[model samples]
Target: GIVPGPPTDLSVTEATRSYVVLSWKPPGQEGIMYFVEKCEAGTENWQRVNTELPVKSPRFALFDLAEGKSYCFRVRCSNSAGVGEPSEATEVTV
Candidate 1:
């Protein structure tokens, strides 16, 4: 396939009061980069975490999260061809 496939199994690998670590299974192709997006649980404003560049690993860390607030996170895969659809959202309370 030209476009990369979506990453899967998005989950919180570690979490605390102020930050969380998320991990996902990579798509079936090599040379694919990743983008992580987050939004408050009740909002539609999904924002990219890696603003400067796409992430190069399956894991991403979100820092300084608001305590007691729920957030939804998702990941997308991109390659030379194009970006793929985002993975299913994973929610966590920080």
Candidate 2:
């Protein structure tokens, strides 16, 4: 079945001094994995921190980020249907 909705509630939470926790679960679609992206203060674009998943998890742990540096993040869901638009970007420090 084709799903219809807009991505929303993009969020970020700090786990430790060097790790930030991420979790967003407002969108849903069959056969899809959420891509978590992160970009440091000097980066040109967000980069994927995880390369593979079974599409069964939307949450991930990101570490080894620049200390005291701000990071931009966003996530998107993709499958046979296609890549839906990404969530609005959120920034946090690591």
Please list the residue runs of candidate 1 whose C-alpha ends up more than 4 Å from where it truly belongs after superposition: 1-17, 51-53
TM-score per candidate, chains pooled = 0.73, 0.65
Question: Candidate 2: lDDT of 4?
Answer: 93
- In the range 1-94, model 2's lDDT, one tens digit per residue, is 9999998999988665576778877584556777777887665777876655544577766666778789888888888878788888778876
- The per-model lDDT (C-alpha) reads 0.86, 0.74
Candidate 1 local lDDT, 20-88, one digit each (tens):
999999977658889888899996999987566668889888678888899999999999999899999
CA deviation > 4 Å runs, candidate 2: 1-17, 42-44, 52-55
Best by TM-score: 1
Candidate 2 local lDDT, residue 76: 86
Candidate 2 TM-score versus the reference: 0.65
Clashing pairs in 2: none
